């Protein structure tokens, strides 16, 4: 009967609850007052990229650490070249709803997506001379809240349907679909290992899926509201989420618990993004109030505070060589930080 | 600098089309299309004459209409509502062949922090099955708390009055209508809506306001 | 399938004109500079003339200032070279070319098919080759050099050069661009490297189709060397 088996599922939801707390012998806040703090972060906007002109939704980095991608809700994915502020390439998007931007490992495809349920992808380096539509990944239900590349053939999408997805680029169908959220999917990070890739929902539980074998390798379940932000920690062994409880939570796949609430008592201001520095030391969440504040992972005590922005400071990366985070805005300037 | 000069130069022909493109999308006015399910969103801009949003547009004497349809695509609403926070209104409609859901819709919609200034246009639609509706049963069922009539005209204001009741906030305006599905009047009302509403950001922009 | 064509070559009268036509398909016009770049019938490559993307820009030889005028149209996909008062010197078969700057973007990564332009009788920066001829071998590894009257590193930390190759009867070809990167469709056979003011360019177990004129040329101010010619 449905009940008996429902009693098994809450007997092996308080085995592993338990057994989670066996493995809870300590927890960092409590081992970190061995290590000093970074001292005040104070980072100051080195550019400005001021050409957009509706609420940049999202942005990433290129691998060569200079370029950009920016997404917008102008309708523009205008991609920079940090260093002179120049638009090198700005592609007509289809749909002006886009929340999700991605830039190729090696830099030769972007593609984006939002309310229109699909991962468009973008081919730059076509010998015709302009940035042109490789694929419309279509077949999501939901909107499309992060996309992420493992290779140049091979993409992940998190939506809004409560799955995500591993695609072939080159022929636009699901390799894998995963599926085993309750509420619907806001962030998704692949690991620097790329073979397993973390996602957050709105109820709360934020997951492992190896891309491999699609099972869950294991649910995390510590914050009161709506996962909002993914990222991986540099070595791919920890994660961390922000969401709309105002605070952002630490999480371990190996220990498959949390270690860290990143919460002040006057920040009750939702978290739009997460990012971490190269060494992981420094976690970089972007608030709804107005500003991102930066955050020692090990610690969580705000390092510094990145703000000067005229609104949501939406989205926000690292570059791969560690000297520049973006903060994307709801203003439209891009500001580039070190 | 080397013959980057050219890539500053292209540079500056990519920024200028960006200018021109938004000095150009900045003149088409947008619209959200809240509504229940099957509320007449879909017949409304039929007669102006799909698995994610649909953002159909339209022009009506020298002015461009984006009229999007986020409804089609369920998920919390929570969620990707706040992309249409800068919509110069919402076209709210409603279906009373029902039903509350509507009712607590509209009471999210309308209160929504996102949308605590942007104006509502209601369009209380299928009158006709209305009438219908009330004249084969009593409106008591819809609504327990009904004391009126039920002629069409005292219970067509009462559930007006209960939709505009739910507004928090006085500075907005709820344009609500009662269309029957009238060819054109719809759209006119549409307009007149919007014309208050961008003379009075016109008129904000000038520090009138 | 990109192509750049020109046409208006033949015999012309010294003192006279005539205009050259780059009739261009395949490729986003628009987004491109271009040169209308030219090579005396039994010598090296000499540069003409630049239109820029949008026509924004232009510069011209200092052989041909005021006399070669170049001009683009967008819309047709068209590059012109007016040429007025034509002397001997401008004798050459002309190959339009293409070019593209953005950061990592490969300039002259076309060329043109080639005008015969013939007439009867009537503070820079040059680069200079070591050698004229190398003979070479298939399956040999041969090893060009050009030097230039410059350091082509700017403060960007690019080096501006370029490498071509040119078989017989064949329109010119891009190999390495700034030195290091390898064009669109050059095998890995080939690769370039050097410093300062000496330069090279390198091909392993060359195959016959290798063979022909190695010409490497500058672009960090707006020539060509005098190049190599390699023997089967």
């Known amino acids: 009967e449905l009940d008996q088996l429902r009693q098994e599922a809450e007997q092996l939801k308080n085995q592993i609850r338990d057994a989670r707390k066996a493995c809870a012998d300590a927890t960092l806040s409590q081992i970190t007052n061995n290590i000093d703090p970074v001292g005040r972060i104070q980072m100051r906007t080195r550019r400005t990229l001021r050409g957009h002109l509706a609420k940049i939704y999202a942005m990433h980095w290129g691998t060569d650490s200079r370029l950009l991608v920016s997404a917008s809700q102008d309708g523009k994915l205008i991609i920079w070249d940090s260093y002179t502020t120049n638009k090198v390439h700005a592609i007509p998007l289809r749909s002006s709803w886009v929340m999700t931007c991605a830039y190729a490992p090696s830099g030769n495809y972007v593609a984006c997506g939002g309310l229109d349920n699909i991962c468009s992808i973008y081919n730059l380096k076509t010998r015709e001379g302009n940035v042109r539509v490789s694929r419309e990944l279509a077949g999501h239900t939901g909107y499309l809240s992060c996309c992420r590349f493992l290779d140049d053939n091979q993409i992940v999408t998190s939506s809004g349907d409560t799955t995500c997805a591993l695609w072939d680029i080159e022929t636009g169908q699901q390799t894998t679909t995963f599926t085993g959220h309750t509420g619907d999917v806001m962030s998704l990070s692949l690991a620097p290992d790329t073979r397993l890739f973390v996602s957050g929902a709105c109820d709360a539980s934020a997951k492992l899926w190896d891309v491999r074998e699609g099972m869950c390798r294991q649910t995390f379940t510590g914050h009161e509201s709506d996962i909002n932000a993914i990222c991986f920690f540099p070595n791919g062994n920890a994660f961390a989420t922000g969401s709309d409880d105002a605070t952002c939570r630490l999480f371990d796949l190996r220990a498959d618990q949390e270690l860290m609430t990143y919460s002040h008592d006057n920040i009750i201001c939702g978290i739009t993004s997460v990012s971490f520095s190269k060494s992981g030391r420094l976690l970089l969440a972007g608030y709804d109030d107005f500003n991102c504040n930066v955050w020692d992972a090990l610690k969580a005590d705000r390092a510094g505070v990145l703000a000067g922005h005229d609104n949501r400071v939406s989205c926000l990366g690292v570059t791969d060589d560690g000297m520049a985070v973006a903060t994307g805005s709801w203003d439209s300037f891009l500001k580039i930080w070190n | 600098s080397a013959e980057e000069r050219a890539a500053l130069e292209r540079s500056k022909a990519i920024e200028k089309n960006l200018k021109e493109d938004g000095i150009s999308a900045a003149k088409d006015v947008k619209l959200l299309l809240l509504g229940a399910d099957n509320s007449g969103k879909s017949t409304i801009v039929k007669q102006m004459k799909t698995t994610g949003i649909v953002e159909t547009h339209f022009t009506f004497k020298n002015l461009h209409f984006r009229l999007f349809d986020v409804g089609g695509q369920r998920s919390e609403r929570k969620k990707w509502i706040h992309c249409f926070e800068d919509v110069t209104a919402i076209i709210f409609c409603v279906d009373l062949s029902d039903m509350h859901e509507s009712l607590m819709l509209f009471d999210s919609i309308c209160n929504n922090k996102f949308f605590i200034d942007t104006s509502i246009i209601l369009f209380l639609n299928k009158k006709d099955l209305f009438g219908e509706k009330i004249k084969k049963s009593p409106l008591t069922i819809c609504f327990p708390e009904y004391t009126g009539p039920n002629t069409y005209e005292d219970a067509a204001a009462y559930i007006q009055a209960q939709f505009e009741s739910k507004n928090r906030s006085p500075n907005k305006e709820i344009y609500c209508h009662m269309t029957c599905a009238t060819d054109t009047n719809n759209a006119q009302v549409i307009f007149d809506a919007v014309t208050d509403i961008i003379i009075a950001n016109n008129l904000r922009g000038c520090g009138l306001y | 399938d990109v192509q750049l064509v020109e046409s208006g070559g033949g015999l012309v009268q010294p003192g006279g004109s005539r205009k050259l036509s780059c009739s261009a398909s395949?490729?986003?016009?628009?987004?491109?500079?271009m040169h209308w770049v030219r090579q005396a019938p039994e010598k090296g490559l000499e540069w003409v003339a630049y239109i820029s993307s949008g026509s924004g820009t232009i510069y011209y030889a200092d052989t041909v200032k005021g006399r070669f005028t170049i001009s683009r149209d967008d819309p047709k996909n068209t590059l012109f070279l007016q040429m007025t008062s034509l002397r001997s010197e401008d004798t050459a078969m002309y190959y339009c070319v293409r070019s593209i700057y953005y950061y990592g973007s490969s300039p002259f990564d076309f060329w043109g098919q080639g005008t015969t332009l013939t007439v009867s009788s009537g503070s820079d920066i040059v680069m200079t080759q070591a050698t004229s001829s190398v003979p070479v071998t298939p399956g040999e590894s041969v090893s060009i050099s050009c030097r230039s009257s410059?350091?082509?590193?700017?403060?960007?930390?690019?080096?501006?050069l370029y490498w071509f190759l040119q078989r017989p009867g064949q329109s010119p070809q891009l190999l390495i661009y700034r030195m290091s990167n390898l064009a669109s469709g050059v095998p890995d056979r080939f690769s370039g490297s050097g410093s300062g003011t000496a330069f090279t360019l390198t091909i392993s177990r060359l195959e016959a189709e290798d063979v022909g004129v190695y010409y490497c040329?500058?672009?960090?101010?707006?020539?060509f060397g005098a190049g190599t010619k390699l023997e089967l």
């Open positions: 395949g490729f986003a016009f628009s987004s491109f500079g």
């Open positions: 040329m500058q672009h960090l101010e707006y020539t």
């Open positions: 410059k350091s082509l590193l700017h403060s960007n930390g690019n080096t501006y």
